[PDB]
Structure 1
Amino acid sequence: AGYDRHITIFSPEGRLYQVEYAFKATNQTNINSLAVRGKDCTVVISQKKVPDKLLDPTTVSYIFCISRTIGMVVNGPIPDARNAALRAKAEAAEFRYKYGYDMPCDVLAKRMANLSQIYTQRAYMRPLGVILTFVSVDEELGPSIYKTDPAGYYVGYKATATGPKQQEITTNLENHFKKSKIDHINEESWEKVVEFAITHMIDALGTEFSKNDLEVGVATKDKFFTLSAENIEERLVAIAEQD
């Protein structure tokens, strides 16, 4: 009649309210993210909002380099985001040591979704209020996007978007894949795939962007990296010349 909403136990309806309230926590930062796949790359975009002028912009980041091949973007508060990041980094190093090959995007995703499930079942652990998006170019599956939530759920995507304005980005992308018929972005270079992602962020959100408003992560064969403000700045000139 009350405490079924404070710890992770079933309610009369069959619901776990603490898990549901953790999903609410992911939007606290008011930041939107999207992810798309190219021919031989994967790109993540995330909004960069630095309201306080006392902050160092270079330290404000929700994209993490988990391993040499895997990158992760977070929607949620930074303390929980960094908790998740460190665990993922630790779990990735351990996998490589134990099993003799680099941990696949989907495998790490499963592992983190399993840990998230545990907090959903055991009482003393709270769920983390974060949604984790893992990206890579797997040596078997190719370009990959895998996303995990506080429910411990995970799935592969053709493309995906996360945040308060998730639905705008989502339907926008769906319409493109109905039009194209193929389930990826037909482009050889990653530079033009990053441009596509930014273009479809603008066309969905309805807002322009400068070099300091964005945060870009790129995954190629055997390398995941993050673009500097200047690399984005170069990428923003390219879109302006076409439209």
Structure 2
Amino acid sequence: GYDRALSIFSPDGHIFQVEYALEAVKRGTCAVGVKGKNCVVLGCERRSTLKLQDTRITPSKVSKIDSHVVLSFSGLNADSRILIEKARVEAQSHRLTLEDPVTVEYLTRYVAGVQQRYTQSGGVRPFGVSTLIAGFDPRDDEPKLYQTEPSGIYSSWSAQTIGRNSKTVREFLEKNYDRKEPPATVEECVKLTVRSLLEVVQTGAKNIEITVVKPDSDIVALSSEEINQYVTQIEQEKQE
């Protein structure tokens, strides 16, 4: 088999293939994760240079891993499918052996482990993908939001963004998100997520996707009209 070490160390102690993988993520469409008091919301950018798209059938940016956990991403779309498949298989494998669905932390740790393995295996390049993994542990009402990246490091976030112009929307969240008092309701949390994307997106038409995850496997994707009402409300309040 093809054995070549593609991810190796440089004199300055960097692994360029892992760092070039992060550049692929920076090129990816923006993805944001905001967790409230009793919910987590995943916002995702869709570039508007593609008209005549069939939004019915086009792969959605937010993927259910199980009935209670969701995965969004920024970077190479083709690469994301391999992580989502492996994660979905591990979710059903965990239920089969432990007789309990995965914790959000466990599913994160697994995906991060796969991403890490591809940074020191022969013949393979790292995943050009960072993920936001959100949901609720079984029989638990505490919201969970984790981030992974090509190197294989993962960590928990009150709120976080990845992809193109993520530094701009991270700036917004860092001053607009209060640790002591997070978004109390679903409406408040969705609004703050939409607001944070409106700093970067362009137009609030068919460019913003919102997915609301609640305790006990309660995940619903918002339609155009539903999201459009939040865009209309924010722009009228802005003009002051």
TM-score (norm 1): 0.87
Deviates more, 1:122-131 or 1:142-151: 122-131
**Letter of the aligned partner of 2:155 in structure 1?**
V
Q: Distance in 2 between matches of 1:201 and 1:52?
A: 19
2:27 pairs with 1:61? no
Worse-superposed segment, 147-156 or 17-26: 17-26
What SS does the aligned partner of 1:142 have? coil
User: Which runs of 5 or more residues in structure 2 are unaligned?
Assistant: none
Between the aligned partners of 2:50 and 2:32, the Cα distance in structure 1 is 25
Identity %: 26
1:34 aligned to which of 32, 35, 56: 32
CA contact (8 A) 1:39 1:184 kept: yes
Give SS of 1:103's match.
coil
Structure 1: unaligned runs, 5 residues or longer: none
Cα offset, 1:13, TM superposition: 2.1
- Alpha-carbon distance change, 206 to 82 in structure 1, aligned in 2, over 3 angstroms: closer
Are positions 1:198 and 2:186 aligned together?
Answer: no
User: Where do residues 150-229 of structure 1 align in structure 2 (5 Å cutoff)?
Assistant: 150-177=150-177, 180-182=178-180, 184-185=182-183, 187-188=184-185, 190-202=186-198, 204-205=199-200, 207-210=202-205, 212-222=206-216, 223-229=218-224
Deviation at 1:199, TM superposition (A): 1.7
Shift of 1:135: 0.6
Deviation at 1:205, TM superposition (A): 2.6
Give the conservation status (yes or no) of the 8 Å contact 1:133–1:147.
Answer: yes
Q: How well do the aligned residues superpose, as a CA RMSD in angstroms?
A: 2.1
1:137 Cα deviation after fit: 2.3
Q: Is 2:97 the counterpart of 1:101?
A: no
Q: Say if 2:140 and 2:215, in contact at 8 Å, map to a contact too.
A: no
Instruction: Verify the 8 A CA contact 1:158 1:183 in the aligned structure 2.
Output: no
Superposed CA deviations along residues 71-97 of structure 1, whole A, max 9, x for unmatched, are 111101211111111111111111111
> 1:94-173 counterparts in 2 under 5 A?
94-138=93-137, 139-140=139-140, 142-173=142-173
Using the alignment, how far apart are the partners of 1:28 and 1:60 within structure 2?
18
